[PDB]
Design a protein around this ligand. Sequence first.
Ligand SMILES: [Pt+2]
Ligand SMILES: [Pt+2]
Ligand SMILES: [Pt+2]
Ligand SMILES: [Pt+2]
Ligand SMILES: [Pt+2]
Ligand SMILES: [Pt+2]
Ligand SMILES: [Pt+2]
Ligand SMILES: [Pt+2]
Length: 129
Amino acid sequence: KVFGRCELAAAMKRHGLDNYRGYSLGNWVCAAKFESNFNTQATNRNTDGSTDYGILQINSRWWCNDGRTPGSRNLCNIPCSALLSSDITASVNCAKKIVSDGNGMNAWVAWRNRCKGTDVQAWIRGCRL
Ligand SMILES: [Pt+2]
Ligand SMILES: [Pt+2]
Ligand SMILES: [Pt+2]
Ligand SMILES: [Pt+2]
Ligand SMILES: [Pt+2]
Ligand SMILES: [Pt+2]
Ligand SMILES: [Pt+2]
Ligand SMILES: [Pt+2]
């Protein structure tokens, strides 16, 4: 699924991301835009052999099992393929764990580099929420 902007904001709100760990909904929408271009099916291999999955590019090193990332963890207890669904439940659940682990949204390199310290409120502009 390739979400529209306000469509993803609505879905993220529904699943509990708005102000989750103090991160406003625009921060999560901005993170998704630069991670996946709002595409639930997005996958990208990392240089260390791990792969990032889904709308928020959750990495197989730590968070899910893809059967091809040696000596990695599966801290969200899910197959990485779960993160590619048109339903964002699995990705949101796992992201709540990630963001709560002490590094906040700095886990998402695209967030730290493209959204942090920017006017993120702009990402929810116009949206019915
Ligand atoms: Pt789809
Ligand atoms: Pt849709
Ligand atoms: Pt939910
Ligand atoms: Pt929740
Ligand atoms: Pt949903
Ligand atoms: Pt959970
Ligand atoms: Pt950690
Ligand atoms: Pt609301």
